[PDB]
Paper text:
In order to visually understand the evolution of the AncTxs, the crystallographic structure of AncTx1 (variant W28R-I38S) was solved. As it might have been expected, the structure was rigid, except at the tips of the three loops. AncTx1W28R-I38S represents well AncTx1 as the two mutations on loop 2 do not perturb the structure, as can be verified by comparing AncTx1W28R-I38S with MT2. Loop 1 is more susceptible to backbone variations, and both MT7 and MT2 are subjected to a large kink at the tip of this loop. The selectivity of AncTx1 is characterized by a slightly higher affinity for α1A and a much lower one for the α1B and α2C receptors, relative to ρ-Da1a. Having recognized that the substitution (I38S) in AncTx3 affects α1D binding and that (W28R) increases α1B and α2C binding, the appropriate substitutions were integrated stepwise in AncTx1 to boost its selectivity. The pKi values for the AncTx1 double variant W28R-I38S were calculated to be 8.59, 6.41, 3.71 and 4.85 toward α1A, α1B, α1D and α2C respectively showing that despite an impressive loss in α1D affinity (3.71 vs. 6.58 for AncTx1), the selectivity of this variant suffered from a large pKi gain toward α1B (6.41 vs. 4.75 for AncTx1 I38S). We increased the affinity of AncTx1 for the α1B, α1D or α2C receptors with just two variants, unfortunately without achieving our primary goal to improve selectivity. Epistasis, a phenomenon already stated as important in protein evolution may have been the cause as revealed by other ancestral resurrection studies. Indeed, the functional effects of a substitution could depend on its surrounding context or sequence background.
Residue numbers in the entry: 1 to 65
Write the structure that this text describes.
Amino acid sequence: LTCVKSKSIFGVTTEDCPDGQNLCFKRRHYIVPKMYDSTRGCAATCPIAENRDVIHCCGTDKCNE
């Protein structure tokens, strides 16, 4: 599995996930309403949506882009 690790106006980083990490995630952490910072990566289990988080997990290559 490959997951996007960074995606910006400057470039994109893709990671081949290590053994045991067969999910990609994209986490949107909201600072104020309708404004948020996005983090992405591989994961073994879908990360917990903590305070102010919306988290999407998926299982195909670069599905979190």
